[PDB]
Amino acid sequence: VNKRMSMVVSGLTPEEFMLVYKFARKHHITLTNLITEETTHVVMKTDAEFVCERTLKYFLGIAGGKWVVSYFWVTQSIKERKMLNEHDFEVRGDVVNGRNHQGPKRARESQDRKIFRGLEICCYGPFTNMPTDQLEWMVQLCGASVVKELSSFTLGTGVHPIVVVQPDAWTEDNGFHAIGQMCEAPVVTREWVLDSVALYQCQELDTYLIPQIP
Amino acid sequence: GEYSRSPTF
């Protein structure tokens, strides 16, 4: 048996989804609303130069080295009544990290050398607009080791511990500045992960570091 | 009816 096509779409209005659903129906393509290991294609809404917004399905698509292509692949197939090749429609960048950083392409080409290789990452809550277990899954797909609690860090010279938090999500407390007192590990924002994934290249922590209290 | 927009970052 061979792997089969399984799609999720992102950034589309319902009406656009319905057009794809009719599309998926005609050419017997599997189409789900939730992305899994079995999902092979991620279809993003882009501009004429194949630049999209950064969504959860966008990040997870890259993390899994899956094919991330533009919505224009569907509309063009309609226009010419054929099934043209998706690869021609791979998104080249996004509105945050660059219009032609070739992240998704590079992501496919480096699964033997994943960007978070040799790292132990703890996603220290809370989080907004992105479930914790999905973010944990994200770094897993990128070769990182997920750590549930701060005390669970491996102690060793070879281990590289990292604490990732989202300052926006904290509303009741200013607690993220005190984490350095509880453990021996760098503390950086969620944006470190997002940028690293989008470019599929491990960014320097310097700019993403969150100031601590000694 | 309502369309929760997909969360964008």
Numbering used by the authors:
A (entry chain A): 1646 to 1859
B (entry chain I): 401 to 409
The authors write:
BRCA1, a large protein of 1,863 amino acids, contains an N-terminal RING domain and two C-terminal tandem BRCT domains. BRCA1-BRCT domains bind to proteins containing the phosphorylated serine-proline-x-phenylalanine (pSPxF) motif including Abraxas, Bach1/FancJ, and CtIP. Abraxas mediates the interaction of BRCA1 to other components of the BRCA1-A complex, which include BRCC36, NBA1/MERIT40, BRE, and Rap80. BRCA1 accumulation at DNA damage sites is an important step for its function in the DNA damage response and in DNA repair.
The structure of BRCT domains in complex with the 2p Ab (Ab2p: GFGEYpSRpSPTF) was solved at 3.5 Å resolution. A notable difference between BRCT-Ab2p and BRCT-Ab1p_short structure is the conformation of the Y403S404R405 region. Extra electron density corresponding to the phosphate group of pS404 and the side chain of Y403 is observed only in BRCT-Ab2p. Unlike pS406, the pS404 phosphate group is oriented away from the BRCT domains into the solvent region, thus avoiding contact with G1656, L1657, and T1658. In BRCT-Ab2p, the Y403 side chain is positioned to interact through a hydrophobic interaction with BRCT P1659 at the N terminus of BRCT1 α1. There are eight copies of BRCT-Ab2p in the asymmetric unit (ASU), and each BRCT-Ab2p appears to dimerize through the same interface either within the ASU or between ASUs. The dimerization of the 1:1 BRCT-Ab2p complex results in a 2:2 BRCT/Abraxas complex dimer. Dimerization involves α1 and β2 of the BRCT1 domain and the Ab2p burying about 1,880 Å2 area. In the dimer interface, two of the α1 helices from each BRCT-Ab2p complex form isologous interactions burying a hydrophobic patch formed by F1662, M1663, and Y1666 with aromatic side chains stacking on each other. The negative surface patch, generated by the phosphate group of pS404 and side chain of E402 at the N terminus of Ab2p peptide, leads to cross interaction with BRCT K1671.
